[PDB]
Design a protein around this ligand. Structure first.
Ligand SMILES: *C(=O)[C@@H]([C@@H]1NC(C(=O)O)=C(S[C@H]2CN[C@@H](C(=O)N(C)C)C2)[C@@H]1C)[C@@H](C)O
Ligand SMILES: *C(=O)[C@@H]([C@@H]1NC(C(=O)O)=C(S[C@H]2CN[C@@H](C(=O)N(C)C)C2)[C@@H]1C)[C@@H](C)O
Ligand SMILES: [Ca+2]
Ligand SMILES: [Ca+2]
Ligand SMILES: [Ca+2]
Ligand SMILES: [Cl-]
Ligand SMILES: [Cl-]
Ligand SMILES: [Cl-]
Ligand SMILES: [Cl-]
Ligand SMILES: [Cl-]
Lengths: 242, 245
């Protein structure tokens, strides 16, 4: 059950942009989107892959808890917030790729593939380097498939411990106030065309949950704030947030 | 309190500017250092009122009275003054709207013996639950000070309480109050009205990237028109110490 609400295209038009927003009303089990075809087009997950990567790392004990310190590897990189020690909370918040590349090496090719199949995550293909396949390898996932994966995480239904799922959902916390809670992860995929930006997660209300997954063309980094802004425009229009 | 508490008396200016009287207690986790405007009141024990929802939720989860934070507790049909209470709730919304009737049923199901044993295990306040099993934190014998709230919250933060790690994680999720790009606040307000002196509480912590600041405040609350000062005075103090922008 998926309704094409093409009136949302205006929110992309207004901003000089092309993309898709997908919403899922958990209570009514109804889905909405501006573009059914792009909603099912698969892209590299890029930094949104930190969600399954964190889950696998916790379930295998590569990460013991959300306070364990991961030492900076001593390589100065362009994003300054990466050149410091991190735990799981701050590595997610600052999208610290080197920490997650190390997770993937310690998970290893065999267990990564097995768990992604267990997760039904995208096309379950990890072809490429073990520490970069979600950046420039074979894995692809659509907006609707992100939703399906996130729904399982929300319900503690993934095939990892309940504890690992609770810790990752804590690490995904982005915004909270008296009206809603957002747990989400951004992404920006540049190594292979098309360059796109991601925002995936959900909005917790008192009596319902709205899952969302959006991607949009992102020729330059100047447009990155449109990921959250366009999603919220749709969320507001649909009365989900004030 | 291994390190001696530090008294910052300039914080009283934030009480007197509102013609109010109270205490703010802060604990810098990295430095293991406590601060307060009034050491005597910091150690004065009061009824916890709604802040007791934190230990109550922990015990109910550990004993299986609450299966998880999605289990629905049906409205019992009685219409009460606070409109948000007249509806079904789960643990998240019962904490958010401080739905007393839900927590009175938690306490009844826990029962006197297990409730006493658990609060002695937590070393919660004066550990005294004399009174009605479903009202002793409103009008019975239990008392806790602001510094004792800090000690209890610090154990909860570190998962050191004598309940399952899972119960502690769930309650910390339910305490979520505020989150933005700078900080996260997990906290619980309280308003004690059945027994004098009427007082307001705000207890919790601020999570930063690299540190956690625990806080506990209470203040005299002769009328409900001062209730916003629980959060506002605490945030003034947090800002003066450059903890939040
Ligand atoms: C993840 O796709 C990439 C990583 N994450 C990311 C983003 O999701 O936008 C960036 S942008 C950079 C500027 N602020 C930081 C951030 O976490 N946000 C914008 C939310 C990081 C960066 C390219 C990774 C594959 O490089
Ligand atoms: C718990 O102390 C009482 C409950 N909690 C509470 C409060 O701490 O504020 C109130 S005040 C009432 C008006 N606004 C709502 C609120 O909870 N907040 C502003 C946070 C509810 C209420 C008296 C319980 C013992 O009655
Ligand atoms: Ca599959
Ligand atoms: Ca003030
Ligand atoms: Ca003094
Ligand atoms: Cl990544
Ligand atoms: Cl399912
Ligand atoms: Cl568990
Ligand atoms: Cl949380
Ligand atoms: Cl209560």
């Amino acid at each position: 059950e998926w309704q094409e609400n093409k009136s949302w295209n205006a929110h992309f038009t207004e901003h000089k942009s092309q993309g898709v927003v997908v919403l899922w009303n958990e209570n009514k089990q109804q889905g909405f989107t501006n573009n059914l075809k792009r909603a099912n087009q698969a892209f590299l997950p890029a930094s949104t892959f930190k969600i399954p990567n964190s889950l696998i790392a916790l379930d295998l004990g590569v990460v013991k808890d959300e306070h364990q310190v991961f030492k900076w590897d001593g390589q100065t990189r362009d994003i300054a917030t990466w050149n410091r020690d991190h735990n799981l909370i701050t590595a997610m918040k600052y999208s610290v790729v080197p920490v997650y590349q190390e997770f993937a090496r310690q998970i290893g090719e065999a267990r990564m593939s097995k768990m992604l199949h267990a997760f039904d995550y995208g096309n379950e293909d990890i072809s490429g380097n073990v520490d970069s396949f979600w950046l420039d390898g074979g894995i692809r996932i659509s907006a609707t498939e992100q939703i399906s994966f996130l729904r399982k995480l929300y319900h503690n239904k993934l095939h990892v411990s309940e504890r690992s799922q609770r810790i990752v959902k804590q690490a995904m916390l982005t915004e909270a106030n008296g009206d809603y809670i957002i747990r989400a992860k951004t992404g920006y995929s540049t190594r292979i065309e098309p360059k796109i930006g991601w925002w995936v997660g959900w909005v917790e209300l008192d009596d319902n949950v709205w899952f969302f997954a959006m991607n949009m063309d992102m020729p330059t980094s100047d447009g990155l704030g449109l990921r959250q802004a366009i999603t919220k425009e749709v969320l507001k229009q649909e009365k989900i947030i004030p």
